Design a protein around this ligand. Structure first.
Ligand SMILES: C=C1[C@H](O)CC(=C/C=C2\CCC[C@]3(C)[C@@H]([C@H](C)[C@H](CCCC)CC(O)(CC)CC)CC[C@@H]23)C[C@H]1O
Lengths: 240, 11
């Protein structure tokens, strides 16, 4: 069932994730603080968190078997397009359905609809994002499946601007097979029912969220006063 | 393309 190589891929992705995701959120204290009374009083803090998250996503992606072996240009495009999606995925670990919020260890760092509203966004985006998280949490994925889904998301050959798609596809196919085989031999019924199919449908939902966020990011960042509240890395990665 | 901060965190 699970070949050595596939076990090796999982071993590497789990190590990578462990090294890029602190489930105590200790570093949150170094962000500009959250204000939950400009109207966007949660923008500074949430931009900082996003920025931070982008750095961790980059660290995770560098450990994806083969990813470092792509050209820089393809590494850059893949990361630019996926960053928001991987941050959304990786956020499922703090998300809680108790009260539909992202619970990052304390009340100060517990984010709900109103916080995200205080970051400049609307309910037309915020609602599908909570719906996304609910559906994804309902999957109750194993950590091995979760890290696999993040990597499969990063190594997508249809991202606009990808130069060597045959090589990106090669990587993702390996991750995909490993994921499919993992579920077959590790994920026991009845949680494994059409599990791959639901996980890949989450990748589709993420593209849709990506598209719409890009639109709102475009209207937010268009105002220089709001752009001023973002980070240099965020400006680079999402654009100006 | 260019992306000095992104590129630098990758190397
Ligand atoms: C380490 C992590 C993750 O990397 C990030 C975590 C949560 C991520 C969240 C929860 C609050 C809302 C966040 C910050 C989103 C922000 C507000 C936002 C997308 C809003 C869509 C409706 C991104 C933003 O538009 C980028 C400029 C504004 C910062 C992106 C990721 C979301 C906590 C924890 O699980």
């Amino acid at each position: 069932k699970l070949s050595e190589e596939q076990q090796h891929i999982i071993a590497i992705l789990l190590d990578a994730h462990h090294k890029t995701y602190d489930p105590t959120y200790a570093d949150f204290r170094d962000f500009r603080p959250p204000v939950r009374m400009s109207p966007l009083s949660m923008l500074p803090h949430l931009a900082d968190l996003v920025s931070y998250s982008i750095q961790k996503v980059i660290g995770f992606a560098k450990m994806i078997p083969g990813f470092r072996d792509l050209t820089s240009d393809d590494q850059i495009v893949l990361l630019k397009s996926s960053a928001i999606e991987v941050i959304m995925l990786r956020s499922n670990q703090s998300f809680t359905m108790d009260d539909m919020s992202w619970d990052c260890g304390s009340q100060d760092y517990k984010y709900d609809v109103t916080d995200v509203s205080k970051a400049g966004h609307t309910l037309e985006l915020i609602e599908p994002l909570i719906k996304f998280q609910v559906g994804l949490k309902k999957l109750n994925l194993h950590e091995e499946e979760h890290v696999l889904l993040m990597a499969i998301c990063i190594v997508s050959p249809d991202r606009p601007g990808v130069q060597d798609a045959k090589l990106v596809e090669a990587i993702q196919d390996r991750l995909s097979n490993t994921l499919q085989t993992y579920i077959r031999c590790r994920h026991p019924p009845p949680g494994s029912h059409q599990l791959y199919a639901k996980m890949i449908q989450k990748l589709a939902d993420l593209r849709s969220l990506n598209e719409e966020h890009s639109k709102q990011y475009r209207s937010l960042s268009f105002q220089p006063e709001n752009s001023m509240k973002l980070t240099p890395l965020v400006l680079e990665v999402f654009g100006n | 393309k260019n992306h000095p901060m992104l590129m630098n965190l990758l190397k």
